Amino acid sequence: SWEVGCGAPVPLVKCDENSPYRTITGDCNNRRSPALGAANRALARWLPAEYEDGLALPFGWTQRKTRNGFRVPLAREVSNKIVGYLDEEGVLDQNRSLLFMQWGQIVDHDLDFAPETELGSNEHSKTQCEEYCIQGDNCFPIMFPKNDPKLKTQGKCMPFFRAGFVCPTPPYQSLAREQINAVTSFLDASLVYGSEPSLASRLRNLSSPLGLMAVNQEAWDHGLAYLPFNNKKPSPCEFINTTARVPCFLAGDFRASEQILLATAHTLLLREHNRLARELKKLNPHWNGEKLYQEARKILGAFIQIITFRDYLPIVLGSEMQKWIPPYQGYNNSVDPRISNVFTFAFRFGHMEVPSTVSRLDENYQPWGPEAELPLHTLFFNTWRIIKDGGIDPLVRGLLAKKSKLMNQDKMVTSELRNKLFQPTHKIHGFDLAAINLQRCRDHGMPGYNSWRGFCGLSQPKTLKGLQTVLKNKILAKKLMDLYKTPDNIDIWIGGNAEPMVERGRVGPLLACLLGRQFQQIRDGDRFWWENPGVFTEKQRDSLQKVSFSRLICDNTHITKVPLHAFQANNYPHDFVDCSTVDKLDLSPWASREN
Numbered sequence: 001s002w003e004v005g006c007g008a009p010v011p012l013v014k015c016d017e018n019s020p021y022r023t024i025t026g027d028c029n030n031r032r033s034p035a036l037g038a039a040n041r042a043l044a045r046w047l048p049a050e051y052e053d054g055l056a057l058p059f060g061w062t063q064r065k066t067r068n069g070f071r072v073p074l075a076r077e078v079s080n081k082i083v084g085y086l087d088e089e090g091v092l093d094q095n096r097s098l099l100f101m102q103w104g105q106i107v108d109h110d111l112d113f114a115p116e117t118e119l120g121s122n123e124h125s126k127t128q129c130e131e132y133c134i135q136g137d138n139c140f141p142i143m144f145p146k147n148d149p150k151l152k153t154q155g156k157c158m159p160f161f162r163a164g165f166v167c168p169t170p171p172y173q174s175l176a177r178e179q180i181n182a183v184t185s186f187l188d189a190s191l192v193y194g195s196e197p198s199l200a201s202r203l204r205n206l207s208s209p210l211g212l213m214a215v216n217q218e219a220w221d222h223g224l225a226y227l228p229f230n231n232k233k234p235s236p237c238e239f240i241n242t243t244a245r246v247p248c249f250l251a252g253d254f255r256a257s258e259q260i261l262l263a264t265a266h267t268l269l270l271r272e273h274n275r276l277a278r279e280l281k282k283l284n285p286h287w288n289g290e291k292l293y294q295e296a297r298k299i300l301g302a303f304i305q306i307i308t309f310r311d312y313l314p315i316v317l318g319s320e321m322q323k324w325i326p327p328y329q330g331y332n333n334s335v336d337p338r339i340s341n342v343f344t345f346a347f348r349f350g351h352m353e354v355p356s357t358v359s360r361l362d363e364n365y366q367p368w369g370p371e372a373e374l375p376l377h378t379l380f381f382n383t384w385r386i387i388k389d390g391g392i393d394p395l396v397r398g399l400l401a402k403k404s405k406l407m408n409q410d411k412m413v414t415s416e417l418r419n420k421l422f423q424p425t426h427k428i429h430g431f432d433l434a435a436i437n438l439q440r441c442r443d444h445g446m447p448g449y450n451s452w453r454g455f456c457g458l459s460q461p462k463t464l465k466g467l468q469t470v471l472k473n474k475i476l477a478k479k480l481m482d483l484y485k486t487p488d489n490i491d492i493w494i495g496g497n498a499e500p501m502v503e504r505g506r507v508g509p510l511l512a513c514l515l516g517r518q519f520q521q522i523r524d525g526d527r528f529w530w531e532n533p534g535v536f537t538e539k540q541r542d543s544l545q546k547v548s549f550s551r552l553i554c555d556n557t558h559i560t561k562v563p564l565h566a567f568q569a570n571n572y573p574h575d576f577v578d579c580s581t582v583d584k585l586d587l588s589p590w591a592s593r594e595n
């Protein structure tokens with residue numbers, strides 16, 4: 001028994017139970033427990049942290065200190081030897097649109113962030129990790145292995161800075177290190193509205209009470225809006241093209257301009273807010289700034305939940321779907337809504353669903369222009385290709401008409417992300433998201449692959465032959481064995497993803513367990529789950545049941561041809577239909593039954 005919460009950042013918790021709306025921070029969702037699921041708290045531990053020194057040192061930190069008697073392979077080496085591949089041909093998912101990937105990142109960003117430590121934004125110390133490759137205090141560089149091509153063109157490591165952790169932050173050493181979650185655990189649309197009341201207000205268009213979200217004043221998208229620019233210099237988005245000089249956007253989530261399609265989806269979501277809001281005033285003139293804001297917010301959340309839970313989850317989890325997430329029975333205030341530390345790694349499967357290129361398509365779903373298809377790496381923190389190069393519409397057409405990468409055991413993560421990732425305050429397009437997941441796994445004190453197979457009630461292979469059988473691959477298992485020398489040491493990110501898919505899923509059984517549990521927990525433990533009676537009306541819930549991503553495009557872009565089932569592989573024109581024939585969101589039940 002160590003205590004009941006460790007809090008020095010528990011920065012004003014006065015509870016109003018009496019609300020028809022969520023807080024911004026997530027506080028006061030569980031009334032019996034007010035801080036459960038709020039942002040700025042520790043990620044839940046489903047299993048105890050496993051650090052090198054028991055407390056907060058990652059496995060791999062001290063050269064001579066092993067895990068279960070072996071050295072841990074270098075993140076980058078696992079990435080070269082197992083994660084890499086060259087041939088992009090035949091890697092596409094024939095049953096998933098590119099929107100299946102992108103929705104995944106939307107939801108992941110609504111659910112969790114564990115951002116790098118904040119005890120250094122303008123010091124030597126920062127560039128000391130990029131420049132000198134010195135394992136330090138929160139600097140934990142990713143070292144290149146003997147044979148690595150990057151040694152020839154980049155230096156000795158990739159810079160990497162340990163995730164933040166709760167309570168102290170300037171010097172710490174007493175209980176087990178627990179990483180923070182800076183977003184709300186609830187599927188709430190916090191990526192559109194922010195998780196802090198500070199940021200939540202800054203994004204609002206206060207200058208008039210129409211419950212509108214603050215839009216971009218310097219540019220437009222033919223009559224349609226953009227997110228406002230974040231004006232913080234220096235700017236990663238300005239850095240990628242000094243001539244076009246377009247900054248990153250300002251969203252309720254800071255990751256929004258990471259890659260162009262993320263920024264597109266975010267863009268659609270704000271347009272829905274405002275659309276929704278305006279349709280409301282054209283119903284209710286009585287309402288003031290808040291009631292319109294909050295009431296569209298509330299609708300934005302439910303749509304997020306319905307799309308994720310009705311359209312998205314069933315094709316991630318497949319046969320395992322109703323096993324982990326059975327039909328809803330209502331809010332269970334005994335359920336734990338917090339995101340587990342492990343989930344923030346399990347949902348990284350999405351990393352293998354990302355293809356090497358992104359296309360703009362025109363009105364006929366043909367190759368927009370002479371640069372239709374762009375390599376993914378040029379789109380990190382790329383906001384200029386939207387504003388100065390077409391709007392979001394051809395990219396959205398892409399999202400429908402194009403396919404996600406299918407995860408593949410001999411072809412795991414495209415080199416766009418594996419060799420050419422762009423990171424802010426780093427000058428080069430040369431990072432490795434895989435190596436970085438793996439460093440991160442260890443950073444976060446993740447129990448290895450068998451602790452999680454155990455936790456999921458699954459077999460624990462102890463030998464190569466064991467692993468071949470589970471992974472159903474003789475080759476991969478062997479390389480995993482050579483690198484790790486016990487399946488107890490396999491990093492959860494790589495072992496869960498190496499597993500073969502379940503029937504009509506896109507993850508293997510261990511991930512479906514980790515994912516399934518977590519999504520069940522975010523539905524059941526949520527007082528404001530759209531389907532929890534008391535949140536909307538019999539009638540309000542009947543309109544909601546009509547919302548489709550297809551519709552969201554229709555009413556928020558100048559696209560007018562869309563498929564029914566946005567998430568599967570859809571080819572023009574045999575799978576498309578007009579905006580016309582697509583059930584819209586009938587907003588009447590939100591008409592004030594008051595004068």
Ligand code: HEM
Nearest residue numbers: 101104105108112113114115259344347348350351354440
């Ligand atoms: C090109 C598209 C994507 C890019 C560029 C990208 C990039 C990144 C980066 C830079 C990080 C932080 C890594 C670290 O420092 O630990 C990250 C983390 C993460 N990624 Fe992605 N990612 C992409 C797509 C996706 C998809 C499709 C999913 C899910 C389906 C996903 C899920 C996650 C999650 C859950 C985290 C951890 C978030 C946290 O809790 O801190 N990503 N990704």
Ligand SMILES: *[C@@H]1O[C@H](CO)[C@@H](O)[C@H](O)[C@H]1NC(C)=O
Nearest residue numbers: 205207208212213214215216
């Ligand atoms: C908010 O909306 C009003 C009315 O549509 C508009 O005039 C104003 O420019 C908007 N403000 C911002 C900051 O987006």
Ligand SMILES: [Ca+2]
Nearest residue numbers: 110184186190
């Ligand atoms: Ca959230």
